[PDB]
């Protein structure tokens, strides 16, 4: 029953500070080496650093990309690992998780081999370094470029631009329209703002019978937008 | 943006064999031992191979690993739908900080349905957006399988890289995949060219949609 639970993540302005903590359970904490790893959106896992066990000197190692600004420490007293982040840069934005160095032991003929690997992993805590702050979305209609009457089905949509933070809820005709609806996951922008699209496909041979209103609800900023799409 | 390099994805039918490469440098894979991990959505990575070619108890021998120079490979024989997950390699750098280094991961899809070409819809900037001094082209890609695509934008005929934002493939309710790509322009630029195009590549075949300010 081993696990690592980290916390302390959140939104921080560039240059600010943040302190992440990781609590362990299910094993003798003092005996293991600990690592901090991070994975930014899209990129691959990057090792941030580690802190050896007290038995091995309790020294710390840091990736060249964070040395001088980050500091790792442990409090074996309460199964806790710490990550103090200073002078944060937007490029430090990522999911941070703690891991332990475990090992598979093999008994050879004359020697005993210990193969190490990142064994226990925490679920991580999100650290967002952005100057972005709460903001409602701009909603623009997405009407088919070519006069859609030739194809059997027509696609109509709503562009929900520049909002923050997540999430944005989108419905059509107050929920009465649910068939042929596709709301795509949001894309994260450099600014720190999100944008998504929602499209509904209707029979081309039907356009004109009724109306299509996209109801955009953004609770975080208490913004509700109803926009009728036409063509 | 990945210390060790692996292909982003690979696909095969159940019962077949498959191999995933991992390329590094003398400073990492060349000098040390490679580990291989398996990861399922929403769970922690599971150790698959260590010491270049060893399997932890519980790992069936359908899994194998090898290392040659600064490259490592993972093989899987007799594929089962249950093997569908992410696979990444790892080692450490023989530098002073002894960094653990990782591959970008390769998504292995175990064909459980017929391959599906993607549907692509390209919307030009709305008139309301232009009056806001902005212009965004929206390329929506859906219902494709397996879940991997490449998106390229064209201005008239010239490739365009500036102003592009593409989301990673996402799993739909019907098990197929979706993705979005946006192209930010200036009202001026949008009117400056004859057309703009969004071409999506999937399993070799490339779909292409176009829009022209003309209307």
């Amino acid at each position: 029953e081993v696990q690592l639970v980290e916390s302390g993540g959140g939104l921080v302005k560039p240059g600010g500070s943040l302190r992440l903590t990781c609590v362990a359970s299910g094993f003798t904490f003092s005996d293991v080496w600990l690592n901090w790893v991070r994975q930014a959106p899209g990129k691959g896992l990057e090792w941030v650093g580690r802190i050896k066990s007290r038995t091995d000197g309790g020294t710390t190692d840091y990736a060249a990309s964070v040395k001088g600004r980050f500091t790792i420490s442990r409090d074996d007293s309460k199964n806790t690992l710490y990550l103090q982040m200073n002078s944060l840069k937007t490029e430090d934005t990522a999911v941070y998780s703690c891991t332990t160095d475990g090992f598979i032991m093999i008994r050879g003929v004359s020697e005993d081999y210990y193969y190490y690997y990142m064994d226990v992993w925490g679920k991580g805590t999100t650290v967002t370094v952005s100057s972005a702050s709460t903001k409602g979305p701009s909603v623009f209609p997405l009407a088919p470029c070519s006069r859609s009457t030739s194809g059997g089905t027509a696609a109509l949509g709503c562009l929900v631009k520049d909002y923050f933070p997540e999430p944005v809820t989108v419905s059509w005709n107050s929920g009465a329209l649910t068939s042929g609806v596709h709301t795509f996951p949001a894309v994260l922008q450099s600014s720190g703002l999100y944008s998504l699209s929602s499209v509904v496909t209707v029979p081309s041979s039907s356009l004109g019978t009724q109306t299509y209103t996209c109801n955009v609800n953004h609770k975080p900023s208490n913004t509700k937008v109803d926009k009728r799409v036409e063509l | 943006q990945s210390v060790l390099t692996q292909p982003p994805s690979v696909s095969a039918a159940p019962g077949q064999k498959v191999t995933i490469s991992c390329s590094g440098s003398s400073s990492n894979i060349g000098n040390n031992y490679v580990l291989w991990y398996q990861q399922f959505p929403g769970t922690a990575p599971k150790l698959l191979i260590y010491g270049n070619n060893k399997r932890p108890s519980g790992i069936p021998d359908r899994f194998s690993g090898s290392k040659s120079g600064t490259s490592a490979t993972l093989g899987i024989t007799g594929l089962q739908t249950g093997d569908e997950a992410d696979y990444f390699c790892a080692t450490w750098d023989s530098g002073l900080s002894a960094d653990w280094v990782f591959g970008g991961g390769t998504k292995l899809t175990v064909l459980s349905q017929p391959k599906a070409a993607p549907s692509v819809t390209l919307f030009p900037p709305s008139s309301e957006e232009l009056q806001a001094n902005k212009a965004t082209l929206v390329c929506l890609i859906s219902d494709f399988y397996p879940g991997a695509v490449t998106v390229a934008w064209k201005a008239d005929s010239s490739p365009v890289k500036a102003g592009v934002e593409t989301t990673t493939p996402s799993k739909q309710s019907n098990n197929k995949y979706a993705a979005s790509s946006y192209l930010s322009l200036t009202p001026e630029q949008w009117k400056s060219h004859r057309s703009y195009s969004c071409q999506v590549t999937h399993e070799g075949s490339t779909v292409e949609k176009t829009v022209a300010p003309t209307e």
């Binding site: 004359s110 081999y113 210990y114 190490y116 | 002894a98």
Partner: peptide, 10 residues
């Protein structure tokens, strides 16, 4: 006698 295979180990 113990052989150690890993980053940060003897």
């Amino acid at each position: 006698k113990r052989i150690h295979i890993g980053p940060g180990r003897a």
